[PDB]
Task: structure prediction
Amino acid sequence: MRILMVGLDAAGKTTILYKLKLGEIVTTIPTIGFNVETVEYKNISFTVWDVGGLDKIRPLWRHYFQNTQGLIFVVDSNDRERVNEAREELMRMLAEDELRDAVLLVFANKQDLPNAMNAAEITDKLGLHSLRHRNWYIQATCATSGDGLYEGLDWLSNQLR
Amino acid sequence: LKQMLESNKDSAKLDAMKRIVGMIAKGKNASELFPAVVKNVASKNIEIKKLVYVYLVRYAEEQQDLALLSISTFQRALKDPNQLIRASALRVLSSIRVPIIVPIMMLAIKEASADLSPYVRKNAAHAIQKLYSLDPEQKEMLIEVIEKLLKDKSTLVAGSVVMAFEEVCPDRIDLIHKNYRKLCNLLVDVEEWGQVVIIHMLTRYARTQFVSPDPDHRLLIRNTKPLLQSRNAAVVMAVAQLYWHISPKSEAGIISKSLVRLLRSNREVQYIVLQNIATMSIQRKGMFEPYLKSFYVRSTDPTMIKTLKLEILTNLANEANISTLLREFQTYVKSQDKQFAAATIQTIGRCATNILEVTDTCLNGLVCLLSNRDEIVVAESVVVIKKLLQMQPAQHGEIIKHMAKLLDSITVPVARASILWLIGENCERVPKIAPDVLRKMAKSFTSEDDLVKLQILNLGAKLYLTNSKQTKLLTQYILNLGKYDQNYDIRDRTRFIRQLIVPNVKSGALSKYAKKIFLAQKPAPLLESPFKDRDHFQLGTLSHTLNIKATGYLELSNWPEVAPDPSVRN
Amino acid sequence: MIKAILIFNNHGKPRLSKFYQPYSEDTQQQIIRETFHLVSKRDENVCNFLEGGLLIGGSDNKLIYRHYATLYFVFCVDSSESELGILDLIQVFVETLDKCFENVCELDLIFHVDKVHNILAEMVMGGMVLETNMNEIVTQIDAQNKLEKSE
Amino acid sequence: LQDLVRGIRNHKEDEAKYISQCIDEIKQELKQDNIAVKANAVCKLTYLQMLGYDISWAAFNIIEVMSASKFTFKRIGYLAASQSFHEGTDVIMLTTNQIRKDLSSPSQYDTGVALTGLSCFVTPDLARDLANDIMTLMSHTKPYIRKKAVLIMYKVFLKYPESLRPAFPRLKEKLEDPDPGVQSAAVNVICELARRNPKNYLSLAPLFFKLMTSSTNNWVLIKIIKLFGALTPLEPRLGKKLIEPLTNLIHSTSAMSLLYECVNTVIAVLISLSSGMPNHSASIQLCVQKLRILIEDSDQNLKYLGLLAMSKILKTHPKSVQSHKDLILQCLDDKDESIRLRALDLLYGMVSKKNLMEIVKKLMTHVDKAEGTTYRDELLTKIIDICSQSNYQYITNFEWYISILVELTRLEGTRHGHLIAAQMLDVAIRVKAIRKFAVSQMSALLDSAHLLASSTQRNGICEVLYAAAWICGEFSEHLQEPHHTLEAMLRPRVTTLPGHIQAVYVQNVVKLYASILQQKEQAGEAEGAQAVTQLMVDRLPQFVQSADLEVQERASCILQLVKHIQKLQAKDVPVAEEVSALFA
Amino acid sequence: MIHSLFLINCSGDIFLEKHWKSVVSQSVCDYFFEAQEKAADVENVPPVISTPHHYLISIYRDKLFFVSVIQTEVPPLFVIEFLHRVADTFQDYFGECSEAAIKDNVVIVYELLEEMLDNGFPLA
Ligand SMILES: Nc1nc2c(ncn2[C@@H]2O[C@H](COP(=O)(O)OP(=O)(O)OP(=O)(O)O)[C@@H](O)[C@H]2O)c(=O)[nH]1
Ligand SMILES: [Mg+2]
Result:
């Protein structure tokens, strides 16, 4: 199953990829290109493309839309200043015909931080309830502790199997 | 590339031969691999034989000693029942330049002449001319081989035999004195190249042995007539230039139809016929009078082919059509081809001298040309005008004064030279314009071309002779400037004119005489078309198109007085 | 450094071309054609040192080559390169191709050109030559081939 | 890939349409899920780039291909990526993940393929982002990885010197790499780094000394000695240190190419050391002997390079170059024009008062054997240069010089005919002693001027006729048959020559008139003078009738002069003194 | 008569060389090159060029030059028209007169010039 994992820089995408794959919290730098791993969950294999989110390289996301079956959109739930920018990037992607059948898993990440917006708040900020003809789910997560990750994968595996 | 040469497989040898053929085509030295190729000389493969023999032809003169080592193979190959192999082997042994082989090639050439195959016979003629290029002293048995060969009836051999006879023995006329009738009978069916060669040699024989227009005179003319319509330009050209020298003047005019017809050919062929027509048009102008229009210049032709048409138009110029051509020539003057304009402007000048009636009418057109901006046209206009003012030495003040001021915008040395002479010659006719022009050029003297510097020293001396009152210092300066010049042609002017002018200390009678000789009326220049110089040569040869008696010229004589006995001809 | 690597037959048809300088595709074809015209007209007895054309960065650079069979192996080099060094480098390339392709010919350069690029790579890489001892070159080559056959 | 080659071979004249269809097929294949078909399309794209088609449209597809875990496809991807990416393609920013994965992986072969690909990705940004990893890889356990890595850090030094600043001690330490091939690559890296700023590598000279001494690989030797020649201008003492091991290598050299390269560098070192220490003429002679060994080689490349090197030692020390003699004039016969002209330059360097005779004689044999207007042109030009060098310094028998110029006059079609005429004029005006032989030869030319009229082109033989007719006129007192020469040069054949030639001919006609008139009147032969005047009153009009301007002026003036002088002679006036004074 | 033929491309180099008699170097084309340099274009070259020992008769058609070597006096338009007939033979065999066709079939070219020209004297 082809999964594209995108979101603003610093959201926690690379942390999530390697926590999912390796069961450890890895030290990262801002990803200039992409990382890729295949993760097996409940006997379904997901190839997850973790594509760098620095603004300069966001144009390159489009190179990964083709044949994508699932989108994981990771949000830094503590970053109120950039949550509208996250919404914009999400909606710009969802406008693409190539992705019209893709299912959308939103990870509302960094829930460990005391001022993190919760899943309900992030839902409002991203405008998810307005989406039409879209299979979507939002999951509160803390990538460093692992909390919420398998629940996200439960939904995604159910969508694609 | 040795290995596949001594490799047994014949296909490898054939590939090597093709590749070395390409090698020679690129001009590259493949002589080092000669021994391997000549080791393959005994091949039974016809294609490989041809290729190795071409290799031998190309590299025989390079590896002369090694070829000398392998001659026995060559004499053995001379008996090969294949005619082409025989010819190629004869060529190979001919190409070898050892002074000792000579008798071997004697036996080879006599056998080849005795050979029944016509191809071998013509290549034997080639062999004997090669021998004469090798040894002049063998000319006796060369001549006897020629005698045997000239008896053969075939035209294929006949052409080569005639060419060889011209190459080696131009003087032994009796051999053709026995076979002129055979040659003229065959010339109907002789091949076109043989047509050309036989026609030229028959032209020599007719000039040397026959007298003024004899049934044999008409027999040549009668049989040569159908070739006027031939597709070959050379046949038509040779037939045409034949009639120019042998046919009566009342019958030679017929060929003008074909000569014009030849002008529709490609560039190079029409280039030569234009030389031929231009020369022969001088003596008989009325012959191409009906075809004046076809000689009009088209813009599509390139520079020199256009130039040649103008020269013919000069010859065809006459009082009955001087007006028609002058109008047409003016149209060509403002053509974009500047070089063609230089030819056109000179063209109108010559016919203006030819037709004294139109001297002013052509002159009036010229002065308008002086106002145009093109440097080459104004440069070429003034010199053509200059030729016309000398021939009509009238006080054309209205013409010189326009010309005199025009100098300051002129850069061409020929034109700048042209300005100086007439104003000097007409110093008494424009005394108010001459003094400043010398002053103008005196300051700039060191920058002008050598040819101009010649005339500027002339201008001062003539100005000094007539108006020394106010130009004496200018003459002193212009003389002193040339005293220390670099170029040498001017130095003679400094030595010559000065002595006539300045040193009255040794003023003999001739010193008094300098004023009249410089101010003498200059005679009209007898302008000559560069084709009357070709009247000494037959039409259609290099000596015709190059105007020079180069190595091997087939010179014609004058027309003899009394006919040698035609009874021997039977 | 070497500026460009040029291989073509006697007819001018290219056979190996890898460049270490940024040149456009049309510039690449023009370089190939200029080199072919500059080289192929020369004799077999000519020195193989022809001053380079204008398509390869100026007169400072040089065209140096060797001809084997019907193949010209041209190395575009600067003035700091040893010209006889470049010739023997071409010779090493020729013998390496001979050993690896088992009597190489123009057919292997046509039909195995990626292998030829790889061979060039271990011989010279980034305008700078990597390995030059033929035996160790062949050991690296067939080690890579052992890798290929392994998986 | 092979099917594409077969199709292109089949579609010779239809290459464009077939290639466009194959490009569309490649577009379709590169967006497939399977990496095999897209990598085959990558092979075809590399072949198309070889043919000259834009490969850059599939940069992301190449990135997709190289992302494969299998090396079999990694090699194709990285090859097309080396041939495809450029500084103007930002898609290379998508390569970073795969590049880092293959760079940090411990595998040997994948790392090698990755670094081979990186050999052409060398941009400032990727250098900035991968220098930290390559500097870790510098001391990698495997030697082959180090061998490729040292070249890749060279590329990084090119595109990121901020890591040059610390790596230079690290690369100097790498200069002790135990693996010979890795050491050779490291020497190449450090040497080509030295080629740009050699001042920072003078202290590395002992390291390079040890490298060359311990090297058994002639390649390191050649390149490092070339870099020595490069650094030789900076410190002559280092070259003085080098001269002994270099000479030892020369003695032990079995590779003629290494021999050339090292001896040429040694000549450069001798140039550097000659500045104050002129006692290495023994090493110079050793170099000369080795250059001879090179020059007798039948290999034309070796031969040309030996010629160039001995030209260098010619501009350095001709005293041993002159030993060659035959060794060069034999090479003069070779089929290569460039080698031959360099040899002619060598003879020009070889010119002396004692050998000018023989060398010029052999070059005359060659001009008789010569072929080519550019060839014969430059040949006669440089003959004129060598004989006229330092104003005829090396010439002793000027009679020989005049004769050889006459032999040159046989060279039809030469463009320096004006130069040849200038040379005869110079030798005539400068040397009084040989004016007699000069005027004899030039009158002989005038006698055959009908044959010489075959070249009417400007700057041709007509200039020779110019000079000949002149110095016949100017030096007429030494003529033996003035009447014959005068009649021959009044012949109507001359009317076809170009203008100023005819003008100067008439100018010489009047000079010959003056000389012969003085001669006839001095003995009292009035009737002969009257006859000759009657001749030119019947001859000068054929000049008067011409079309050329200066010809018209000269002919008119001189015709009036001569005729009215005849009128004076009818009065019995000794006009000879006056006409002689006209040109004294 | 025609002892050699030199084909020359548009660039001014020796495109092809063949001989029937004593070989003369490709060098004799240098007079033709000088004539081209003095000529305004490829349509301003005089057909007749003189050399110290030979003579150069040249024609121009189909963007190629046919430079020939002539040693002694034989008629010019003869040589010109034979050169043009040889060019017509190129056109008849190849189908067009071009550099590429001759470069491809040099061997057939030399076969054809051997067939047309025999030891300097054209005859077929
Ligand atoms: N507090 C907290 N920090 C997290 C969490 N997840 C990731 N991070 C930290 O956020 C920072 C950025 O994480 P990355 O995974 O590099 O972010 P990214 O989305 O991959 O960023 P780009 O590579 O630029 O696209 C790192 O310092 C992570 O350790 C989380 O759940 N809680
Ligand atoms: Mg990341």
